[PDB]
Amino acid sequence: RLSGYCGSPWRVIGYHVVVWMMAGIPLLLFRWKPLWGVRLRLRPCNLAHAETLVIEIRDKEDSSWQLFTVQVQRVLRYYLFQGQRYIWIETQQAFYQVSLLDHGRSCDDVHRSRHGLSLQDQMVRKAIYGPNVISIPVKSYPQLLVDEALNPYYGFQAFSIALWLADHYYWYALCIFLISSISICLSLYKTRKQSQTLRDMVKLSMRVCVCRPGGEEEWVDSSELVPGDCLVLPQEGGLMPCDAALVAGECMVNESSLTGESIPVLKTALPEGLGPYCAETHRRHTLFCGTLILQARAYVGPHVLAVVTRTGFCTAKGGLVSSILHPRYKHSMKFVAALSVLALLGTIYSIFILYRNRVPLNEIVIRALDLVTVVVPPALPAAMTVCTLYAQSRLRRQGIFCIHPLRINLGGKLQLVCFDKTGTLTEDGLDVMGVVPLKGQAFLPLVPEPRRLPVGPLLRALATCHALSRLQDTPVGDPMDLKMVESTGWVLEEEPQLQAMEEPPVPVSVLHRFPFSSALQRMSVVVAWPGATQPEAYVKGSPELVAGLCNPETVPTDFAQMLQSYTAAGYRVVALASKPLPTVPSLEAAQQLTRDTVEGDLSLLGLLVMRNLLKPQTTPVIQALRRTRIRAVMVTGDNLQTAVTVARGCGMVAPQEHLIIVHATHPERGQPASLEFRHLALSGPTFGIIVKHFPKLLPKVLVQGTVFARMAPEQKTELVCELQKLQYCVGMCGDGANDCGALKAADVGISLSQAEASVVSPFTSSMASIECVPMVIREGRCSLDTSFSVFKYMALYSLTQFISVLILYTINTNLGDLQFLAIDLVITTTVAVLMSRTGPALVLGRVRPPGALLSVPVLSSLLLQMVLVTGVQLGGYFLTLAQPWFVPLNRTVAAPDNLPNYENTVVFSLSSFQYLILAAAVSKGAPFRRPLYTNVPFLVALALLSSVLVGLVLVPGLLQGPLALRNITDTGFKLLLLGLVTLNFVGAFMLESVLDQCLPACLRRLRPKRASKKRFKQLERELAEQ
Ligand SMILES: Nc1ncnc2c1ncn2[C@@H]1O[C@H](COP(=O)(O)OP(=O)(O)O)[C@@H](O)[C@H]1O
Ligand code: ALF
């Protein structure tokens, strides 16, 4: 990602203001290519040292952004671009981001001193790094009102209002203005809600203290953190201002709003060692933003000291917020082109008819302008943007809590869902099943049974090698750690904070404890006890990792079968190693905090066999997702056999399963295809070594691959990117923190076991089940179907209104004043506002919704529907003209003063029901949405409208004076018109429920072949090599 920056300070006075004062009219039409405006308006020639208005050149992205270099102080010229600050350097003589003294600099030799930020001239660090606060720009009511009238739609509406006011019409203009004001207030309410859901999510202000060198303490506001500072963390509480680094002491934070887990993580102080310092590998030495310190009193002295790393919008939480709250079709163009073509043809026909009627030109332009300016139904942007709001409002009452609806339509076109293993498909609580010793009788099994029989170092290695921590009620931590501690018989009591109780043979004390990270799957600990000449060091982790990190003679040639037999049953077994820890290493390592040499000559002691059970609400959702031709793979980090037996516990798709056999270390890395005892399974290193050597077999294994075990936290993002590169819609459903970065690089992200709409992912659920992905998919498909139906209904309404105007303008006839208002408000707006009902059903569908709005079936449906409408219209016209009626008085009183007549009455009476008929004929679906008899408010509204409509075609005693209607004593109000409107109402349904069959599909299916999404031919070519 590269881009240039060129600008100029200012231009000389003169015509540079007149040019933009005169060329301001075509600004509404010059929205395309915005570089021309900034190039012709203000673009003088100057040097390259005093830029004030800088514009960027398009190199990789077609966009444009305007900036302003503010100067508060040297020069100190800087601007705000997407929240990131850019300063002007003197050495490189170019713009530089805020990345100095980091990512390759600020070594430990100058970072492990922390003099204390002596009282110098603090005027250069506040204007460069900015204030230590996350201020969200908010807008007031006039500020939000002045910038919303920039769209050309509002200008067209204002022009229509002016044209209606300049024609002695104060009724239609009033309703149009009311609808526009309703749309404006709805948009302002939506913007206010979208701003309030973010302003309340960020942290608030507090009162903290900043330490100074010596005996100086001040109570300043909670904004003083600058890169390279040192603050104090009293009260043993959380509420972290921004990112920081703990250099002295240990602490435990709660990264629940940054990772997605409520498990306490232990933070270790930064040790010595001259090397690079970056925020990519020291995940246990720094403190991120939004962390809650559980219990950390002091380690050396009165209290611990923390070092500030970064402040502003580039922190861990602020950067993620700015990156995930960043603002990111072709058939619509042809649709509006055809609509404009039909409109111009109709207006040409109308002007030809008017010229044939021998009418002077003074009355032709006023009608032509009105006809060309009235083509779009009111509340167009208010009806297409309210469906997402209604969906977001109705999803809150089910469990899904989204931060902002942006990718709702993407859920309806999903084809691959990734599921986790622990926390998603299985229960989080484990169960112990005994200890399998490996040191008894010269590396021999002792028939392990589930009991509590510790001999020798088994008590300390099982009761001390952990990361337990109590908060006034009980030790809380990892579930496996709790299950191991409770199955031992030891109680942790309050270094005095790491002591135990009930020690039969000898009391024990924990000197040092190393936490667990995502990079390495192990954890060391220092275990000492009075009565020995040297302590011991234990470590717990995966057997495959500790097998090549110990003595070559620790287990005979029986582990490859024992581990497989223990993992092929559904249990979870781990390995525990031990180190003799002689006097010299224990003395020279307890004062340096080393890790490369402490994990050397290890010795296995025993194995902990756990038990993981699946959730009883997993098989129905899995079957429902499998019976809808939707691929579902499992991406975990456990052993291969564990994932295999977990997948076999349900058995979705596994014909002739194949696995990659271990002990494959060929120089050419040639992995063959073996048998288990169509689909393949990939491991961590197995998938890692097939992406660099041979870059030609990746799309062949990724399709059939459904079991991804032993994965790495840094490899899941690469897999997601490789899956998305093939034009897919893969979505991961993770629970732990090992797959946090993969959710930020996918289309959809599940946030199970979260709350308050965590920022870790836009979609967030409030239940521990997998029944949220199908719900999201069906909600998205229902929203897409509703939007398509609304667009089709709007197009049909526009076309039928054009046809009505055309048939009304045959010689000289105009509709009523209040009739247009009653049609656009009661008949059109009321049914369009309440059209977002009838959500998704409880049964999914195998057929996928279409992604285009200009298909052959829908176009043929619209064409046949309009043919039927014009046919029934001409039939009604012939019927009302073939009756013994009176004679008109045209060509002598032609003026807007003879509104009550028999010309437009029957036309309006026949056209008013057309909208109500077409509204209930396009918004319906059996497998996508709910039937029409489910929503009660819309049903009673339609009933009230139908009653009001039928109340006028019989006994015309009222609602005729102000409405400009007349009375008739003929059979017009009788079945003569009722039998016709009912016939049309039935014919519309009969014609709409016939083309929805698979006839057009099978007619347009046998003609073409598989190309342009030739996925079928791709699968055929893939299977052709078998
Ligand atoms: N008590 C423990 N102490 C240290 N490491 C452990 C412990 N339990 C599991 N591990 C490590 O975790 C890895 C598997 O993690 P996994 O279950 O995939 O995490 P997640 O379920 O969050 O994806 C194993 O390689 C193992 O080394
Ligand atoms: F099984 Al997991 F994150 F819980 F891979």
Ligand SMILES: [Mg+2]
């Ligand atoms: Mg998880």
